[PDB]
PDB file of C-alpha atoms in Angstrom:
ATOM      1  CA  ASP A   1      -1.000   0.833  -6.822  1.00 25.66           C
ATOM      2  CA  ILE A   2      -1.262   0.046  -3.166  1.00 19.57           C
ATOM      3  CA  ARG A   3      -2.504  -3.273  -2.790  1.00 20.75           C
ATOM      4  CA  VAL A   4      -2.938  -5.114   0.245  1.00 19.47           C
ATOM      5  CA  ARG A   5      -1.901  -8.686   0.123  1.00 18.24           C
ATOM      6  CA  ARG A   6      -0.140 -11.349   1.766  1.00 20.46           C
ATOM      7  CA  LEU A   7       2.672 -12.805   0.244  1.00 21.61           C
ATOM      8  CA  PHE A   8       2.596 -16.778   0.843  1.00 21.11           C
ATOM      9  CA  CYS A   9       6.272 -18.436   0.341  1.00 20.17           C
ATOM     10  CA  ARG A  10       6.781 -21.552  -1.101  1.00 24.52           C
ATOM     11  CA  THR A  11       8.639 -22.444   1.441  1.00 25.25           C
ATOM     12  CA  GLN A  12       5.000 -22.823   3.350  1.00 26.69           C
ATOM     13  CA  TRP A  13       5.475 -19.304   5.149  1.00 26.57           C
ATOM     14  CA  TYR A  14       3.888 -16.006   5.112  1.00 26.50           C
ATOM     15  CA  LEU A  15       5.849 -12.829   5.494  1.00 24.47           C
ATOM     16  CA  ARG A  16       4.837 -10.859   8.986  1.00 25.57           C
ATOM     17  CA  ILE A  17       6.528  -8.397  10.707  1.00 23.70           C
ATOM     18  CA  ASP A  18       6.243  -7.759  14.232  1.00 23.72           C
ATOM     19  CA  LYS A  19       5.665  -4.186  16.267  1.00 22.70           C
ATOM     20  CA  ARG A  20       9.489  -4.680  17.221  1.00 23.03           C
ATOM     21  CA  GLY A  21       9.350  -4.744  13.608  1.00 24.75           C
ATOM     22  CA  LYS A  22      11.102  -8.786  13.039  1.00 22.88           C
ATOM     23  CA  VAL A  23      10.377  -9.627   9.894  1.00 24.31           C
ATOM     24  CA  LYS A  24       9.856 -13.810  10.002  1.00 26.54           C
ATOM     25  CA  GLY A  25       7.585 -16.215   8.113  1.00 21.88           C
ATOM     26  CA  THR A  26       4.741 -17.904   9.846  1.00 19.48           C
ATOM     27  CA  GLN A  27       2.029 -20.599   8.938  1.00 20.35           C
ATOM     28  CA  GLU A  28      -0.553 -18.448  10.932  1.00 20.24           C
ATOM     29  CA  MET A  29      -2.743 -17.238   8.168  1.00 19.34           C
ATOM     30  CA  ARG A  30      -4.567 -15.138  10.639  1.00 18.79           C
ATOM     31  CA  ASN A  31      -2.056 -13.470  12.134  1.00 19.18           C
ATOM     32  CA  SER A  32      -2.875  -9.829  11.604  1.00 19.73           C
ATOM     33  CA  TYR A  33       1.082  -9.306  11.239  1.00 18.96           C
ATOM     34  CA  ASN A  34       1.338 -10.525   7.962  1.00 19.24           C
ATOM     35  CA  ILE A  35      -1.687  -8.341   6.570  1.00 18.33           C
ATOM     36  CA  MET A  36       0.854  -5.817   3.893  1.00 17.51           C
ATOM     37  CA  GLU A  37       0.765  -3.019   1.770  1.00 16.05           C
ATOM     38  CA  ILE A  38       2.618  -3.420  -1.408  1.00 16.20           C
ATOM     39  CA  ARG A  39       2.521   0.429  -2.337  1.00 19.99           C
ATOM     40  CA  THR A  40       4.131   1.096  -5.985  1.00 20.54           C
ATOM     41  CA  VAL A  41       6.575   3.201  -5.949  1.00 22.43           C
ATOM     42  CA  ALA A  42       7.312   3.803  -9.363  1.00 26.46           C
ATOM     43  CA  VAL A  43       7.788   1.522 -12.317  1.00 27.75           C
ATOM     44  CA  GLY A  44       9.441  -1.874 -11.348  1.00 28.84           C
ATOM     45  CA  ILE A  45       9.927  -0.549  -8.227  1.00 26.33           C
ATOM     46  CA  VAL A  46       7.201  -1.334  -4.226  1.00 26.54           C
ATOM     47  CA  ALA A  47       7.404  -1.494  -0.666  1.00 25.13           C
ATOM     48  CA  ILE A  48       6.237  -3.809   1.594  1.00 27.88           C
ATOM     49  CA  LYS A  49       4.169  -2.504   4.542  1.00 26.80           C
ATOM     50  CA  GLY A  50       2.914  -3.816   7.490  1.00 22.36           C
ATOM     51  CA  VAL A  51      -0.939  -2.904   7.862  1.00 24.10           C
ATOM     52  CA  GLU A  52      -0.303  -3.484  11.970  1.00 24.61           C
ATOM     53  CA  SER A  53       3.092  -2.512  12.200  1.00 22.46           C
ATOM     54  CA  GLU A  54       3.456   0.227  10.362  1.00 25.14           C
ATOM     55  CA  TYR A  55       6.965  -0.845   9.636  1.00 25.42           C
ATOM     56  CA  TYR A  56       8.378  -1.698   6.091  1.00 22.59           C
ATOM     57  CA  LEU A  57      10.797  -4.401   4.745  1.00 25.52           C
ATOM     58  CA  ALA A  58      14.108  -3.538   3.761  1.00 25.91           C
ATOM     59  CA  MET A  59      17.286  -5.504   3.251  1.00 24.40           C
ATOM     60  CA  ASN A  60      21.020  -3.992   4.569  1.00 24.25           C
ATOM     61  CA  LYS A  61      24.015  -3.459   3.299  1.00 22.82           C
ATOM     62  CA  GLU A  62      24.709  -7.863   4.210  1.00 23.15           C
ATOM     63  CA  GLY A  63      21.431  -9.123   3.345  1.00 24.91           C
ATOM     64  CA  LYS A  64      20.299  -8.799   6.406  1.00 23.30           C
ATOM     65  CA  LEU A  65      16.441  -8.198   6.501  1.00 19.09           C
ATOM     66  CA  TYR A  66      14.348  -6.033   8.559  1.00 17.97           C
ATOM     67  CA  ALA A  67      11.461  -3.227   8.982  1.00 16.61           C
ATOM     68  CA  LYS A  68      12.111   0.485   9.905  1.00 17.66           C
ATOM     69  CA  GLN A  69       8.980   3.153   9.515  1.00 16.62           C
ATOM     70  CA  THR A  70      10.715   5.692   8.044  1.00 18.32           C
ATOM     71  CA  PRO A  71      11.924   4.781   4.795  1.00 19.69           C
ATOM     72  CA  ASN A  72      15.030   4.714   3.039  1.00 19.62           C
ATOM     73  CA  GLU A  73      16.562   3.321  -0.194  1.00 17.99           C
ATOM     74  CA  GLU A  74      17.143  -0.141   1.551  1.00 17.74           C
ATOM     75  CA  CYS A  75      13.084   0.127   1.984  1.00 14.94           C
ATOM     76  CA  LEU A  76      12.475  -0.475  -1.983  1.00 12.87           C
ATOM     77  CA  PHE A  77      12.345  -3.355  -3.774  1.00 12.83           C
ATOM     78  CA  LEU A  78      12.251  -4.225  -7.529  1.00 11.27           C
ATOM     79  CA  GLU A  79       9.045  -6.229  -7.832  1.00 11.27           C
ATOM     80  CA  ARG A  80       9.263  -9.137 -10.722  1.00 12.02           C
ATOM     81  CA  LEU A  81       6.325 -11.355 -12.186  1.00 13.21           C
ATOM     82  CA  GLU A  82       7.366 -14.637 -13.160  1.00 13.18           C
ATOM     83  CA  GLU A  83       6.592 -16.802 -16.285  1.00 13.79           C
ATOM     84  CA  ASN A  84       4.843 -19.157 -13.472  1.00 11.57           C
ATOM     85  CA  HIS A  85       2.697 -16.327 -11.912  1.00  7.31           C
ATOM     86  CA  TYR A  86       4.776 -16.290  -8.592  1.00 10.47           C
ATOM     87  CA  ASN A  87       6.573 -12.969  -7.803  1.00 10.83           C
ATOM     88  CA  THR A  88       9.881 -12.153  -6.727  1.00 14.27           C
ATOM     89  CA  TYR A  89      11.915  -9.332  -4.851  1.00 13.82           C
ATOM     90  CA  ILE A  90      15.410  -8.118  -5.585  1.00 10.11           C
ATOM     91  CA  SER A  91      16.680  -5.143  -3.412  1.00  7.72           C
ATOM     92  CA  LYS A  92      16.721  -1.993  -4.960  1.00  3.97           C
ATOM     93  CA  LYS A  93      19.932  -1.016  -3.194  1.00  5.20           C
ATOM     94  CA  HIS A  94      21.861  -4.184  -4.210  1.00  5.69           C
ATOM     95  CA  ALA A  95      19.852  -5.405  -7.659  1.00  5.93           C
ATOM     96  CA  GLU A  96      22.716  -6.629  -9.860  1.00  8.42           C
ATOM     97  CA  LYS A  97      24.044  -8.034  -7.306  1.00  7.62           C
ATOM     98  CA  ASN A  98      20.878 -10.312  -7.128  1.00 11.60           C
ATOM     99  CA  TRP A  99      19.839 -10.260  -3.353  1.00 11.85           C
ATOM    100  CA  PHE A 100      16.371 -11.882  -3.229  1.00 10.19           C
ATOM    101  CA  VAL A 101      13.752 -11.791  -0.421  1.00 14.09           C
ATOM    102  CA  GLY A 102      13.365 -14.674   1.185  1.00 15.13           C
ATOM    103  CA  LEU A 103      12.027 -17.252   3.459  1.00 20.21           C
ATOM    104  CA  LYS A 104      13.812 -19.978   4.465  1.00 22.74           C
ATOM    105  CA  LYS A 105      12.420 -23.552   5.114  1.00 25.67           C
ATOM    106  CA  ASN A 106      12.515 -23.068   8.616  1.00 22.85           C
ATOM    107  CA  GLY A 107      11.514 -19.805   8.534  1.00 19.56           C
ATOM    108  CA  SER A 108      14.022 -17.323   8.781  1.00 21.02           C
ATOM    109  CA  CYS A 109      14.855 -14.785   6.415  1.00 18.14           C
ATOM    110  CA  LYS A 110      17.002 -15.623   3.638  1.00 18.39           C
ATOM    111  CA  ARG A 111      20.280 -13.420   3.804  1.00 20.16           C
ATOM    112  CA  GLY A 112      20.800 -11.282  -0.028  1.00 22.01           C
ATOM    113  CA  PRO A 113      23.950 -12.634   0.022  1.00 21.98           C
ATOM    114  CA  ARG A 114      22.316 -16.467   0.129  1.00 19.71           C
ATOM    115  CA  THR A 115      19.598 -15.843  -2.041  1.00 17.86           C
ATOM    116  CA  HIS A 116      19.811 -17.341  -5.333  1.00 15.04           C
ATOM    117  CA  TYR A 117      17.091 -17.367  -8.609  1.00 17.49           C
ATOM    118  CA  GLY A 118      15.922 -20.412  -8.815  1.00 15.26           C
ATOM    119  CA  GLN A 119      15.568 -21.063  -5.015  1.00 13.43           C
ATOM    120  CA  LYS A 120      11.507 -21.740  -3.628  1.00 15.06           C
ATOM    121  CA  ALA A 121      12.663 -19.422  -0.739  1.00 17.70           C
ATOM    122  CA  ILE A 122      12.673 -16.478  -2.856  1.00 18.79           C
ATOM    123  CA  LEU A 123       9.082 -17.200  -4.837  1.00 22.70           C
ATOM    124  CA  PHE A 124       6.154 -15.333  -3.216  1.00 22.16           C
ATOM    125  CA  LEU A 125       2.650 -15.869  -4.095  1.00 19.16           C
ATOM    126  CA  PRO A 126       0.876 -12.653  -2.965  1.00 16.72           C
ATOM    127  CA  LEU A 127      -3.194 -13.558  -1.753  1.00 17.25           C
ATOM    128  CA  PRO A 128      -5.480 -10.657  -1.160  1.00 18.20           C
ATOM    129  CA  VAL A 129      -6.856  -9.661   2.194  1.00 17.37           C
ATOM    130  CA  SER A 130     -10.116  -9.804   1.481  1.00 17.36           C
ATOM    131  CA  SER A 131     -13.168 -11.920   1.310  1.00 21.81           C
TER     132      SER A 131
END
């Protein structure tokens, strides 16, 4: 239920959250702020937490992505497995209006409203943080 992976994005970026709690991608594998804890809070729901910044991952009322430290329902995400074996994450608060978590080609966080299914920006491959 608690998995520490990296979350590699199809757009060639790992999701990383700063100490200032700034959400953003990186081509720096060995970045330590890109090691995340995907905690299953319920069937289908997940929380995404930085194992270094101790911050979460959330999305506001206008699709903007951020990271708290003290959870709320904006820190919860509908986690999905695809037929291809990548994963998708829809905001729980704004599900059914379909705002996916995404990282642009430039590494920027996609806005919940700008995201759409079939985008490469919203596709993640959670890699293990072990050895």
